[PDB]
Amino acid sequence: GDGRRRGGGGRGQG
RNA sequence: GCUGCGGUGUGGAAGGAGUGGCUGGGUUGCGCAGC
Ligand SMILES: [Cs+]
Ligand SMILES: [K+]
Ligand SMILES: [K+]
Secondary structure: OOOOOOOOOOOOOO
16 A cells, blocks of 8 residues: 555545 | 545644745645445
8 A cells, every 4th residue: 555645635645 | 656635734813735844843744434
């Protein structure tokens, strides 16, 4: 699972 | 690989989910959770 570590709105980008 | 929650703050006690985010912690960091 080496992708988006966290979600919701713009959280966890970059 | 995807997604949800201002839930967290060397401001988080008058805020949001970035219509402030090339103005900072932060190429949206940190925690929790789901597929
Ligand atoms: Cs934040
Ligand atoms: K802020
Ligand atoms: K913030």
